[PDB]
Amino acid sequence: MTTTMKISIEFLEPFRMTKWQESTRRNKNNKEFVRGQAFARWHRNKKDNTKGRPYITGTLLRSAVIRSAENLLTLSD
RNA sequence: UUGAUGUCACGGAACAGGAACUUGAACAACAUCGUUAC
């Protein structure tokens, strides 16, 4: 019914990560959740204990692919 | 550990001001050590 395509990205430069926020101040009114939306995120299991790993939102990769498609469709009319 | 119809964060130089400085003839004469004797 569905087909899975596994991808992997590899960096050539030191990337940048954002801070950890709480589940309350995670809306459009906080000025630290915005301005940190184009970076990687830090997920910590069992909150109130800084122990976890980084990850990357899939919506950000979707937006980048959309921008690349917009820029590639204007070259072939 | 995201949710979708809308992310210019490669949109932003850790930058800007503060004398390791001040003072000094490579020169020269009087002793050191304690007890003996009635």
- How was this structure determined? It was done by cryo-EM
Checking each nucleotide's C1' against the CA of A70, the nearest proves to be B6
Contact A57, A42 (CB under 8 A): no
DSSP A3-47: ---------SS---B-----SSS-STT-TTTTTSTTSBEEEESSS
Residues A21, A30: Cα–Cα separation, whole Å: 10
**How far is A25 from A70, CA to CA, in rounded Å?**
33
* Strand B contact with A56 (CB < 7 A): no
Produce one character per residue of A5-15: b if its CB has 16 or more CB atoms within 10 Å, e if not.
eeeeeeeeeee
**Calpha distance A50→A46 (Å, rounded):** 9
Closest nucleotide to the alpha carbon of A37, via C1': B7
CA of A77 to C1' of B2 (A): 33
Strand B nucleotides, any atom under 7 Å from protein beta carbons: they are 1-4, 6-7, 9-12
Six-digit token string for A33? 């959740």
| In contact, A50 and A44? CB cutoff 8 Å | yes
